[PDB]
């Protein structure tokens, strides 16, 4: 897919600003979501996983424990007509990252390992080459 995955961001970072209201977050997570890039750098920012998990909560992407929900996540991918295999990989990547990612005292940090491992898998999968503008907007790049 690749495009469908960017494109499906109808509300995906629209609602960042609601979570940024609700949790009084700062506005640099707007960079953190905007194409992870790098090769293997877990960004130092931590409030990002809080915003991520807030979105995943509102989007019913997770079970009420915090494991991801395969079919509920799949329904988000089906919206534009993703690839069946890409949609299933982006689920299995969770099942892989969580298998490595131990535990943490803070569910934002718990998420962030998995959250970064997701963008890592997409990178080594050769599904994020040089396209840029994946989640975000262009509002005087400076």
Curated annotation (Swiss-Prot):
Q: In which tissues is it expressed?
A: Antenna.
Q: Please, which domain of life does this record's source organism belong to?
A: Eukaryota
GO molecular function term, any single one: pheromone binding
What InterPro entries is this protein classified in?
Answer: Odorant/phero-bd_Lep (IPR006072), PBP/GOBP (IPR006170), PBP_GOBP_sf (IPR036728)
Q: Which residues form a coiled coil?
A: none
Q: Which UniProt keywords apply?
A: Disulfide bond, Pheromone response, Pheromone-binding, Signal, Transport
Q: Which cysteines are joined by disulfide bonds?
A: 19-54, 50-108, 97-117
- What is a biological process (GO) this protein takes part in? response to pheromone
* Family label: Belongs to the PBP/GOBP family.
Indicate the quaternary assembly: Homodimer.
Q: What exactly does this protein do?
A: This major soluble protein in olfactory sensilla of male moths serves to solubilize the extremely hydrophobic pheromone molecules such as bombykol and to transport pheromone through the aqueous lymph to receptors located on olfactory cilia.
* Protein name per the record: Pheromone-binding protein
Species, as recorded: Bombyx mori (Silk moth)
């Amino acid at each position: 897919s690749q495009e469908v995955m960017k494109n499906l961001s109808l509300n995906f970072g629209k609602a960042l600003d609601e979570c940024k209201k609700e949790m009084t977050l700062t506005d640099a997570i707007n960079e953190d979501f905007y194409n992870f890039w790098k090769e293997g750098y877990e960004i130092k920012n931590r409030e990002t996983g809080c915003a991520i998990m807030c979105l995943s909560t509102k989007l019913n992407m997770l079970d009420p424990e915090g494991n991801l929900h395969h079919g509920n996540a799949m329904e988000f991918a089906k919206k534009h007509g993703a690839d069946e295999t890409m949609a299933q990989q982006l689920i299995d990547i969770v099942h892989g990252c969580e298998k490595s990612t131990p535990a943490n005292d803070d569910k934002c940090i718990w998420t962030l390992g998995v959250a970064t491992c997701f963008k890592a898998e997409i990178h080594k999968l050769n599904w994020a080459p040089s396209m840029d503008v994946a989640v975000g907007e262009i509002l005087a790049e400076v």
